[PDB]
């Protein structure tokens, strides 16, 4: 299930396996619209959806895959090294993985701290 997100900025789009409850639950909630919410070299949005079972947790993961971030009601895109590792790009909390950036890779170095996020479901 594929999901574009643009901004001001730029662009991205993420595809997002759906075996997962939350993708099927986000599929009532799209488009939707959110602040770029920035934490070093990640940005996460405040989702509509809530949900916290998580199907395929990790404790990190590459620079181009995507997690929800169930304790906060918050997306993940994961883009750089953190501030929060030393070996690993390591998340802030065991996040499942269950999308992967599959565009936008160094679009995401130039948004802001608020560049209004409009994300719709891709394949337009």
Do not use: A, E, Q
């Given at each position: 299930m594929r999901v574009e997100l643009l901004f001001e900025s730029g662009k991205c789009v993420i595809d997002l396996n759906e075996e997962y409850e939350v993708v099927k639950l986000l599929k009532e909630k799209i488009p939707f619209e959110s602040v770029v919410n920035t934490w070093g070299e990640e940005i996460y949005f405040s989702t509509p959806v809530n949900v916290q079972k998580m199907e395929n947790p990790r404790e990190v993961v590459e620079i181009g895959d995507v997690g929800y971030w169930p304790p906060g009601k918050a997306l993940c895109l994961f883009f750089g090294k953190t501030?929060?590792?030393?070996d690993k790009i390591q998340p802030a909390s065991a996040v499942n993985v269950i999308g992967k950036i599959v565009e936008g890779l160094e679009d995401l170095k130039k948004i802001k701290d608020g560049e209004k996020v409009a994300v719709r479901f891709a394949s337009s």
């Open positions: 501030p929060m590792s030393d």
